[PDB]
Structure 1
Amino acid sequence: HWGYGKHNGPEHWHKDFPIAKGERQSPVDIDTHTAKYDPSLKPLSVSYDQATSLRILNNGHAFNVEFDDSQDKAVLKGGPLDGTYRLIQFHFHWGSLDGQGSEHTVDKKKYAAELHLVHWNTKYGDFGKAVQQPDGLAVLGIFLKVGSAKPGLQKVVDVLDSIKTKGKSADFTNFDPRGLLPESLDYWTYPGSLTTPPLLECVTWIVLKEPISVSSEQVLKFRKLNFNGEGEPEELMVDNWRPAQPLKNRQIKASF
C-alpha cells in the first residue's frame, strides 16, 4: 500500500489511484507574482470557540486530531466558501530536515511543516457524501517555520509518545485549535484535491499567507513517530509530503 518511500511513494500512486494525474491535484507552488488579487473575496470566518477534540491517532502516514462534528461546533465560512464547513480533524506533513516538509510552496520556498485543518460542507449531511462533491471540502493550510516555540502546540507534542506506532490512539479532549492560528487571516485559495490517496478532487484550498513558528525541539518530536506498526522494523515518520503538482489552467486568487 501507498506510503512515502522509494517503492510506494508519490510517484507510484497513479498506478492505484489514476486520478493522481488529473486536472485539479494538490499541492501546487504558489507563484505570488501571478496569483490574482480578487477584491470580491470575503474575509475568512473561523468560529472555533465551541470545538470539541476527542482523539489523536497515528494512522500510518501522519497523526490526526479528531473532532466531534455532529453539530456546528467548530466551523469555517466566508472567504471563497458558500455555506458552512464543519471541522472534523487536523494533521500535519513534515520533513526530516527544517527546509522541507510543507506540501504547498510559496515561490518555490519550502517550509518545515504544514498543518491541514480539514472541514466538510454541511449541505451534504456527512463526510462520506461531501467527498462525492466538487465543493465538498475546504482544507485550511497553515505553514510552520522553525523559530520560537508555539505554546498552543505543546499539548499535542506531549501526547506523541502515547501514539508512537501505527494504529495507536489516546483520548485528546479539550484541545482548542485557536492556539494554532497566525495573527493574519490573509489567504490564497484555489480549487484542488486531497494530497494523499484517494486524491479526490473535492477540495477548496485556503492557504494562509502567514506562517506560525514552532521551536526546533517541537518539530524534532514529530520526527520520532513511526510509520510502522508495533513490533516491526522501525521506520521514522519523516517526509510525509507530496511534491507540487501542475497548476494546469487553475488560477490562484489572493485576498490581499
Structure 2
Amino acid sequence: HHWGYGKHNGPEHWHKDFPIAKGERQSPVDIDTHTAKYDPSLKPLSVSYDQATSLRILNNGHAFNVEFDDSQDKAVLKGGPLDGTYRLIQFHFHWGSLDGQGSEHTVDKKKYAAELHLVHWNTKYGDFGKAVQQPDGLAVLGIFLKVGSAKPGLQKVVDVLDSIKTKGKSADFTNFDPRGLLPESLDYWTYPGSLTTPPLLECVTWIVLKEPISVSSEQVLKFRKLNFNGEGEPEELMVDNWRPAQPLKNRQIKASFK
C-alpha cells in the first residue's frame, strides 16, 4: 500500500508515512501575485542547456522522467536566487484529467493544465542523494503549461510515450534539447520549499516562471494515455498526478520582475 494519487493513497494520506508532509516549507504553494515582493537584488537566471545530454525516458509509476547525464557540468542552472551551480538531472511533468487542473503551483488560485519541473542539484554536495539532505540542495525550474497551440519542442517527448505506457518501462531518449521547452521570458517567482512527491524533503529552491508555455490538446491527451499500473495489470490512467497547494507558513515569495 504505497503512496500515489488515488483516494486511498493520495496526498491527504502521505503524512502517515512521511510526516514532513505537514512541515514548515512544503511545496507546492499558491503564488499570490499581489503579495509576492519584487526583489531588485535577485539576478537573471542563467539557464545553460546547450551541452545537455539526455539519456533515457522512464515511466516510474507516478510520472515519466527524462533523464540526463549529470556526471559533468553539461546542463546547469545558476544565478537568480541561487548560490553556485546546479546540474540538471531530470525533468518530468504533472498534469490533470481535464484542462482545468494539473499544475501543482497555482497563480492567484488559477490551475494550469500541467506543470514541467526541471530538477537540478547543487554541485557542492557531490551527488543528488547527498543534495536532497540539504536545505539548498536542489533547484527546480517550474514551467506552467496551458492548452492552445502545440509546443514543437515537446513533440519528441509525446511521440515516445506509447513505448513507456506502463510503470517500469523505459526507452532510449538521446539528443533531446530541453531548450525547446522554455518560454520566451525568464521572469520568475522564487521561494524555499520541498519535493512535491514523497519523501517530500525540504531541500528545494523553487523558481517558477511567470510565462506559461502552450501545448496542444493532442499533446496533453497523449500524456493522459499513460498508465500508473504495470504491464498486464488493469488500466489506471496516469492523470491527476499533482499535489495541491500547501500552507505558505513563514515564507515570502519573491518576484524577479516588477
Please tell me the TM-score bracket, short chain as reference.
over 0.9
Query: Could you tell me how far apart the structure 2 residues matched to 1:247 and 1:201 are?
Result: 13
- Post-superposition Cα deviations, 1:98-119, rounded to whole Å, max 9, x if no partner, equal 0100000000000000000000
3-state SS of 1:102 partner: coil
Query: Could you tell me how far apart the structure 1 residues matched to 2:133 and 2:200 are?
Result: 12
Matches within 5 A, 1:104-123: 104-123=105-124
1:195 Cα deviation after fit:
0.1
Where do 5+ consecutive residues of structure 1 fail to align? none
1:153 Cα deviation after fit:
0.2
- Post-superposition Cα deviations, 1:106-156, rounded to whole Å, max 9, x if no partner, equal 000000000000000000011111011000000000000000000000000
Query: Could you tell me how far apart the structure 1 residues matched to 2:48 and 2:5 are?
Result: 34
Query: Could you tell me how far apart the structure 2 residues matched to 1:243 and 1:40 are?
Result: 30
Q: Provide TM-score, normalisation by structure 1.
A: 1.00
- Post-superposition Cα deviations, 1:53-73, rounded to whole Å, max 9, x if no partner, equal 000000000000000000000
Moved runs in structure 1, 4+ residues, more than 4 A? Answer: none
3-state SS of 2:124 partner: helix
Is 2:78 the counterpart of 1:73?
no
Query: Could you tell me how far apart the structure 2 residues matched to 1:209 and 1:155 are?
Result: 24
Query: Could you tell me how far apart the structure 1 residues matched to 2:234 and 2:16 are?
Result: 26
1:233 Cα deviation after fit:
1.0
1:215 Cα deviation after fit:
0.2
Query: Could you tell me how far apart the structure 2 residues matched to 1:122 and 1:210 are?
Result: 28
Number of positions where the alignment pairs a residue of Structure 1 with one of Structure 2: 256
1:249 Cα deviation after fit:
1.5
Where do 5+ consecutive residues of structure 2 fail to align? none
CA RMSD of aligned residues (A): 0.3
Partner of 1:255: 256
Query: Could you tell me how far apart the structure 1 residues matched to 2:70 and 2:244 are?
Result: 30
Q: Provide TM-score, normalisation by structure 2.
A: 0.99
Partner of 2:46: 45
Is 2:99 the counterpart of 1:98?
yes
- Post-superposition Cα deviations, 1:196-233, rounded to whole Å, max 9, x if no partner, equal 00000000000000000000000000000000001111
Query: Could you tell me how far apart the structure 2 residues matched to 1:132 and 1:194 are?
Result: 11
3-state SS of 1:109 partner: coil
1:95 Cα deviation after fit:
0.1
Query: Could you tell me how far apart the structure 2 residues matched to 1:223 and 1:32 are?
Result: 30
1:190 Cα deviation after fit:
0.1
- Post-superposition Cα deviations, 1:130-186, rounded to whole Å, max 9, x if no partner, equal 011000000000000000000000000000000000000000000000000000000
